[PDB]
Write a protein that binds this ligand. Structure first.
Ligand SMILES: *Cc1c(COP(=O)(O)O)cnc(C)c1O
Ligand SMILES: *Cc1c(COP(=O)(O)O)cnc(C)c1O
Lengths: 487, 478
C-alpha cells in the first residue's frame, strides 16, 4: 500500500505556487490603494464563477491554482486601507506569519504534551494582557470569540454564587438578574438564552447622551429586580461600544457592584486594546476592579480572527473547577511532566485552536511601544477625520467620538437646508444605503452603516488599519461627496 | 503621518523567509520518518529556549526569523506518520494551502458583504455534508469545535420543545432529561452544565461489551426519567467513540426516539467521515433519521483544526429562530444562526482539499485507514506481548503491551495493576526518544492501554511494523 499523502515532488511545487499567488494577489494587491477593496458580484454570478459543487473526481494542480486565484480575486480585501466596514482592518505581516506557522503546525491548545511551545506561550500572553489591565496575578483563557468570552464570564459568576448548579441546574434556584447597557446588549442576551437564564434575566440599563451607562439607573434597576424576586449577580460594563465606541464609567459602576456584592464583568472586546496607550488608557480607569475582562486583540491590535481573551483576577482555579470534568481514580496515571500547565479543564471546548502565536509574534516585532504608536495614531486619524468633515458641506456628525468610531450622516445636495421638513429624517435615512451600494459596486471603499436610538441610518467609520494615512481620510470624504452629488 | 503597517520590501522579505522556514522545517522535516515526531524539552528548559516575555521594545527581522525557527523546531509534529496521539494526524497540502489563503484574507463568516466567496462556499460544503448524511435539504452551521456543536444541538432541541425558554429561562420549564452512552464524549455533560440544565439532567445509558449503547437500557432510563416527572427531550447517540471507536446502533435508537417523540442527535464528530466510504458507511446506518448530526472533518478527513459542522434536517429556520437577536438577499447572511458574532472561515481548507481529491480520493484514504488498522491488529496477534482490548470497529486500535517480566503472570493477583503502569513508562520513553507518540488511557474496570489511531494518509504497512518493533524494543527491559 502506497502513502496517499501526495507525490512529494508535487507538494513543494504546489505550495510554492500557492504562496506565490497569495503574495501577489492577497498580500500585495489586497493592501494596495491602487486596487479595489472588493469586486462585487451578484450571488448567482459568483456561484457560476466559482463552480463550487464537490464531486466524485479530483482535480489537477493547474485547476486548483485557478480556483485559488478566483477565491482571492473575489474575496473582500480586509487588509485594504479603504476597508472601514468592521472593528478589524489591516494585514499585519507578523501576525500573518504567526497565522501561517500555526496552520502548518496544526495542533490543539490542550496539553503540554501536544502543544509544549503554545502552552507556555499562551500563559505569557495572558499574563501580559492581565498586566495591562492592572493585575499582576490571575487567570484566563482564549475563547472562540468575545461573545463566548462573555458567556464564560456569566457562567463563572453563576458558579461562584451557586456552585451546585453545575450538577443540579438553575431551575430550582432563585431568579437571577444581570445588568448591561442599552448600548451593548446583544451577545449578553444571546448568552443568557444559551445559558438557560432566558433573555428576560438581562436588565437593560439606560445610557446617556454620550452612550455611557448611567450608574444611577443601574442602581435603580438592581432595586427593581430585587422587588420582582430576583437575585442580582452580575453587571456587564462595556469599554468601547460597537457603534459609538463609548466607554462606560467603570469606577462608578464598580462602586455599585461593591455595594451589592455583584460580579463585575467588563466587555472590553473592542476598547481593551486601548490599555496599550499611556495617553488613552484612562478611558478604562477602574477596570482593575473588575472580576473579569473580555478583550479581542483581533480587533484593534489586528491579530487575526479569532483572538479573544477572558481575563480574571481569580487565583482559586475557578476556571478548572467550573468547567472541568470529573476525573477517574481507579489507576494511577504517571505523567512525566507538570500537568498543572494543561488547560483542558478550564474550557467547555475540547479541541482548541492555537490563537496566541499570531499575537505573540506581532508583539515581539512591535513591542509595547509599536502597538502603542499604532493606537495613538488611530486616535489622531479619527480626530483628523472629524475636524475635516466639519469643513465640508453635507456631513452631520452624530457626536464627538470618544474612540476611533466616527459616526455621521452624509446630507446630499437635495436635502441640504431641508432640515425642518416633516419627512427629513425619513429621507436622510435612505441615503447611506444607496451610497454603500455605490461604493461597493465601484470597489473604492466600504463603510458600515446602521440606525441607532431614534435616528436612522448613519455611517460608522472605524479608524483601525495601521496603514491609514491622512490621504485616506481625505479620500473617504471626497468619495462620499462624489458618489452623493446626485442624491 | 506615515503608514505603520510596514515597508513593503521588508514585508515581502519577511514573509518569503517565514514561508521557507515553514516548508523546510514544518512541512518537509515535520512529515519525514527520518526526523523526530517531537523534540522533548522540560518546561523550564523550553521557557529558556523561547524567551517568551513580551516587552516594551520590538525586535529585528533577524530576531523574528530565529523565533519562527525555534517555535517550529520545538513544536510537536502532528503531520508526522508516527504521530498517533490524537484523532487527527497528517498534513494534507491542499488543506494547508486553503488554511494559508484563509489567514491571508482574514474575514468573518458573517455576511455576504464581507465574505461573498466563503458564504457561498460554506453553503456548498454544508449541502455536501448533508447529502452524505442522506438529506437533500436542511440547515447547518460550522461551530468552534464539536463540543460546541453538541451544545448547539441540545439548545436547539430545548427551543424546539419549549421556545419560551429563550426568553423566560429554565426555571419556568419542567425538569428536562437527556440521554447518552457511558462511552460518550464528556462534552455532553460539560454542555448540560453550561446550558443551565446541570450534569444531573444527563442520564448515562449502559454500553455493551463492544462499547455500543444498549437500546433496552435507553428505554429503561427514559421510563425512569418519566416516572420522576422529568421530561425526556433528547438522545445523543455516538457514531465513533473517542477511545474504542464504537458505533451506536442508530436504527434501534431512532426507533426508541420515535416512540417517545425525542430529538435524536448523533455525535459523529469522529465517525461521520466514514460516510465518504461506500464499504464502511453502513456503520452509520440510520443516521438519516437524526434531527441533528455533529461531524468534524478536522479529524479523519485532515482538514485542519477546527472544522466542525452541525447538520440539521430542519428547513424551518430553527437555527435563526433559536439563536437570532440591502442590495442582496439577506437570507445569505448567517449571523442569526449562531451565538457567536464574529466567526472564522473554516470551509475553504476542507473545500480545496475535497476539490483536489474528490469523493474518490477521500474515500480511498478512509478505506486505506481501515485496511491499515486491521493490518496492525492482525500483526499484533502474531507477536508475544500484545493483548488486544477488542477487535476494532473503526480505526482506533486499543491494546496493552505486556513486557517480558509480566508474560505468563496473568493469574498473579496483582497482574492488572502492574500492567497498567507499563504504558506510562513506554510513553515517556518514546516521547524522549522522539520516535513516536501514542496516547493511553484506562477504561472500565481495567488500567492504562494504548489507543493507536490509524488516520494519517501517509501511513504504510512499514509504519505499522515499525510501531510494533519499537514497542518491543522500548519494553524489553520492563
Ligand atoms: C466584538 C464585540 C463583541 C463580540 O465579539 P466577537 O469576537 O465578534 O464574538 C462583544 N462585545 C463588544 C463590545 C464587541 O465589540
Ligand atoms: C472529538 C469529539 C468530540 C469533541 O470535538 P471537539 O472538536 O474536540 O470539541 C465530541 N465527541 C466525539 C465523539 C469526538 O470524537
Amino acid at each position: 500500500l502506497p502513502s496517499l499523502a501526495g507525490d512529494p515532488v508535487a507538494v513543494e511545487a504546489l505550495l510554492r505556487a500557492v504562496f506565490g499567488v497569495v503574495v501577489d494577489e492577497a498580500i500585495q494587491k489586497g493592501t494596495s490603494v491602487s486596487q479595489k477593496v472588493c469586486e462585487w458580484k451578484e450571488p448567482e454570478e459568483l456561484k457560476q464563477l466559482l463552480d463550487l459543487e464537490l464531486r466524485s473526481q479530483g482535480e489537477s494542480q493547474k485547476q486548483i491554482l485557478e480556483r485559488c486565484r478566483a477565491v482571492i480575486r473575489y474575496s473582500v480585501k480586509t487588509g485594504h486601507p479603504r476597508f472601514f466596514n468592521q472593528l478589524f482592518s489591516g494585514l499585519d505581516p507578523h501576525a500573518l506569519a504567526g497565522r501561517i506557522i500555526t496552520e502548518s503546525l496544526n495542533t490543539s491548545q490542550y496539553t503540554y504534551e501536544i502543544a509544549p511551545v503554545f502552552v507556555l506561550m499562551e500563559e505569557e500572553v495572558l499574563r501580559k494582557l492581565r498586566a495591562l489591565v492592572g493585575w499582576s496575578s490571575g487567570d484566563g483563557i482564549f475563547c472562540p470569540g468575545g461573545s463566548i468570552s462573555n458567556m464564560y464570564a456569566v457562567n463563572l459568576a453563576r458558579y461562584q454564587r451557586y456552585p451546585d448548579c453545575k450538577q443540579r441546574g438553575l431551575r430550582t434556584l432563585p431568579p437571577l438578574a444581570l445588568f448591561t447597557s442599552k448600548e451593548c446588549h446583544y451577545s449578553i442576551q444571546k448568552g443568557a438564552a444559551f445559558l438557560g437564564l432566558g433573555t428576560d434575566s438581562v436588565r437593560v440599563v439606560k445610557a446617556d447622551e454620550r452612550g455611557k451607562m448611567v450608574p444611577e439607573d443601574l442602581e435603580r434597576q438592581i432595586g427593581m429586580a430585587e422587588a420582582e424576586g430576583a437575585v442580582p449577580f452580575l453587571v456587564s460594563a462595556t469599554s468601547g461600544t460597537t457603534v459609538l465606541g463609548a466607554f462606560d464609567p467603570l469606577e462608578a459602576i464598580a462602586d455599585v457592584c461593591q455595594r451589592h456584592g455583584l460580579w463585575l464583568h467588563v466587555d472590553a472586546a473592542w476598547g481593551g486594546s486601548v490599555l496599550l496607550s499611556q495617553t488613552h488608557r484612562h478611558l478604562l480607569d477602574g477596570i482593575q476592579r473588575a472580576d473579569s475582562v473580555a478583550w479581542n486583540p483581533h480587533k484593534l491590535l489586528a491579530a487575526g480572527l479569532q483572538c479573544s481573551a477572558l481575563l480574571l483576577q481569580d487565583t482559586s482555579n475557578l476556571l478548572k473547577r467550573c468547567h472541568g470534568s470529573q476525573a477517574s481514580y481507579l489507576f494511577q496515571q504517571d505523567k512525566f511532566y507538570d500537568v498543572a500547565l494543561d488547560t483542558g479543564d478550564k474550557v467547555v471546548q475540547c479541541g482548541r485552536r492555537v490563537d496566541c502565536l499570531k499575537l505573540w509574534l506581532m508583539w515581539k516585532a512591535q513591542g509595547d511601544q509599536g502597538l502603542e504608536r499604532r493606537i495613538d495614531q488611530a486616535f489622531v486619524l479619527a480626530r483628523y477625520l472629524v475636524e475635516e468633515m466639519k469643513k465640508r458641506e453635507g456631513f452631520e456628525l452624530v457626536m464627538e467620538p470618544e474612540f476611533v468610531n466616527v459616526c455621521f450622516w452624509f446630507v446630499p445636495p437635495s436635502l441640504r437646508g431641508k432640515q425642518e421638513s416633516p419627512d427629513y429624517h425619513e429621507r436622510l435615512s435612505k441615503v447611506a444605503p444607496v451610497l454603500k451600494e455605490r461604493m461597493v459596486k465601484e470597489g473604492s471603499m466600504m463603510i458600515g452603516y446602521q440606525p441607532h436610538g431614534t435616528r436612522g441610518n448613519f455611517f460608522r467609520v472605524v479608524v483601525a488599519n495601521s496603514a491609514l494615512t491622512c490621504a485616506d481620510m481625505d479620500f473617504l470624504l471626497n468619495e462620499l461627496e462624489r458618489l452623493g452629488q446626485d442624491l
